[PDB]
Amino acid sequence: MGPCDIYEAGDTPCVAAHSTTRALYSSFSGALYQLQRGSDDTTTTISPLTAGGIADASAQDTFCANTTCLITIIYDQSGNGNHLTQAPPGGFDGPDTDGYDNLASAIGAPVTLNGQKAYGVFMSPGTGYRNNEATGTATGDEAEGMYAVLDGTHYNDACCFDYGNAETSSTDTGAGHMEAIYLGNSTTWGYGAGDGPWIMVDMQNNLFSGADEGYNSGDPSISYRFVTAAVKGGADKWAIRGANAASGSLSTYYSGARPDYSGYNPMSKEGAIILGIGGDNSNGAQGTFYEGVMTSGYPSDDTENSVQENIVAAKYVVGSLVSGPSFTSGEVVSLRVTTPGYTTRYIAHTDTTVNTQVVDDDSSTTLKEEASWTVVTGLANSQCFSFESVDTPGSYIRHYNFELLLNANDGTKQFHEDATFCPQAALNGEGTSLRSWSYPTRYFRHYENVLYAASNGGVQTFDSKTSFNNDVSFEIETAFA
Ligand SMILES: *[C@@H]1O[C@H](CO)[C@@H](O[C@@H]2O[C@H](CO)[C@@H](O)[C@H](O)[C@H]2NC(C)=O)[C@H](O)[C@H]1NC(C)=O
Ligand SMILES: O=[N+]([O-])c1ccc(O[C@@H]2O[C@@H](CO)[C@H](O)[C@H]2O)cc1
Ligand SMILES: O=[N+]([O-])c1ccc(O[C@@H]2O[C@@H](CO)[C@H](O)[C@H]2O)cc1
Ligand SMILES: O=[N+]([O-])c1ccc(O[C@@H]2O[C@@H](CO)[C@H](O)[C@H]2O)cc1
Ligand SMILES: *[C@@H]1O[C@H](CO)[C@@H](O)[C@H](O)[C@H]1NC(C)=O
């Protein structure tokens, strides 16, 4: 029995079932998600390897070889047609074409499920998915449940990393017009104990950590790499439950009446589905989604408990973010350009500007140090790396407005995330490509001999698809200094 079989047995069946990692019904053998690759802009689907099984990650790796991939569609396994696609503009514009939100990388969230590789949905600020034409989802004050398995360590405080029920117009239509899982450390509305992040419920114009606006002591900080968030709502009742998705049981952090503020009882749900964004298209949040569902009816605690036991049995474990030659902490390197016409250039810097320059044995010692990089444990991810200046110790290559700058580590989460890069076997086969940990659609990329965190196509000039594979491939050489 998969999660949706368990919900059905509790007479609260799934009406939307979304996962890039696995089938959520024991008999589902259809497509889990759609990929689009940058090389030819064509698509393919990824299905489970067996009915009721795990995503064919090998088929993704094959399709995405020597290029970049985006997850274009997360299919609804339930048969209701509630597929998640690129989220449209609403109250807020996204940063993509026509104010759409960005699609996620296919490769930002590698995992294993019982030892088998799969890929989650790693969502950087400005990423979002939606279905405003959803069928079967609860509306008005009708009962529903939902859950998601999320990365409890990938979050921020911006509005809003949500999964669940939202407005069909992509605008704020008032209190009670949403009911979605939220994960992050926003303290604009609700928050819990400790420093966050918190699972809360987005009910529109409020993230609730419980019955009260603001602080609720019973909502703990999440301390799990894989978190099961289970949320449910019915007629003047709702709940927040949380578990380590890798071990043990759901605990209940809120259960009872709707918050006693105008507009939350009865609810006015609209039945649209969102992922990674707020109901009005607020698109500042980040997070990672692995699997989740929405149901018809208010699930029992027992049904949710059987779902959690199923999740634990799936055995989520962190996967490898790194491929290709890679690095050791304390190694000093120079990174040589491989693009035809520029192959004598190395990644260097002039003060804060990271650039490419011709560097050779006759260059000034000043330039040799500027073309030399101390590789250290990733500031935001210990599998990945950060690139420390030899001439300016304590300063690292970071992205800022998607340009690579050499800036001093200020100890902030923002800097750490901006300064962390995951080596990948070079897209042209010549050395390494350095993928942004925080924006895995983007890579170290030279454009007019300046370094950017560029995507393979996009809204910035330096996201040009011309020479992309070459422009993101660098040979790892002995440091000049
Ligand atoms: C969410 O958690 C982050 C990470 O701890 C908090 O980050 C701090 O932001 C302040 C300014 O608001 C900086 O001066 C600190 O250096 C930050 N700390 C780190 C470690 O980056 C953030 O404040 C939290 N957000 C809210 C709303 O509480
Ligand atoms: O007035 N504002 O500054 C403002 C901006 C965004 C905003 O977002 C709404 O409130 C969030 C919390 O419920 C929901 O996800 C979103 O639709 C709610 C209020
Ligand atoms: O132009 N701005 O007002 C502006 C706002 C935010 C901003 O964020 C920076 O740009 C992001 C992308 O490189 C990094 O994650 C962050 O440090 C960079 C620039
Ligand atoms: O308008 N231009 O002057 C101009 C010239 C070259 C050019 O190519 C880019 O710059 C080259 C070197 O960084 C990269 O290989 C390529 O993406 C991009 C723009
Ligand atoms: C594709 O990338 C792999 C890994 O770097 C490499 O071995 C292979 O040579 C590349 N092929 C092409 C056509 O670039």
Please tell me about this protein's structure:
The PDB classes it as hydrolase. Keywords: Michaelis Complex, Arabinofuranosidase, GH54, Aspergillus, hydrolase. It forms a monomeric assembly. The entry is titled "E221Q mutant of GH54 a-l-arabinofuranosidase soaked with 4-nitrophenyl a-l-arabinofuranoside". The protein has 481 residues and is mainly beta. The protein has 2 domains: 1-320, Jelly Rolls (Sandwich); 321-481, Trefoil (Acidic Fibroblast Growth Factor, subunit A) (Trefoil). It is 9% helix and 36% strand. It is built from 6 helices and 32 strands. β30 and β31 form a beta hairpin. α1 packs antiparallel against α3. The longest helix has 14 residues, at 301-314. The radius of gyration is 23 Å and the shape is elongated. Bound molecules: a molecule of 2 linked components (NAG-NAG), 4-nitrophenyl alpha-L-arabinofuranoside (3 copies) and 2-acetamido-2-deoxy-beta-D-glucopyranose. The site of a molecule of 2 linked components (NAG-NAG) has 6 residues, from loops. The site of one 4-nitrophenyl alpha-L-arabinofuranoside (KHP) has 7 residues, from β26 and α5.
Rg is 23 Å
Distance between the termini: 59 Å
Largest sheet features? 9 strands, antiparallel
CATH top level class name of the largest domain: Mainly Beta
Tally of separate helices? 6
CA-based shape: elongated
Look at the helices and sheets and give the structural class. Answer: mainly beta
Helix content: under 10%
**DSSP E strands, number:** 32
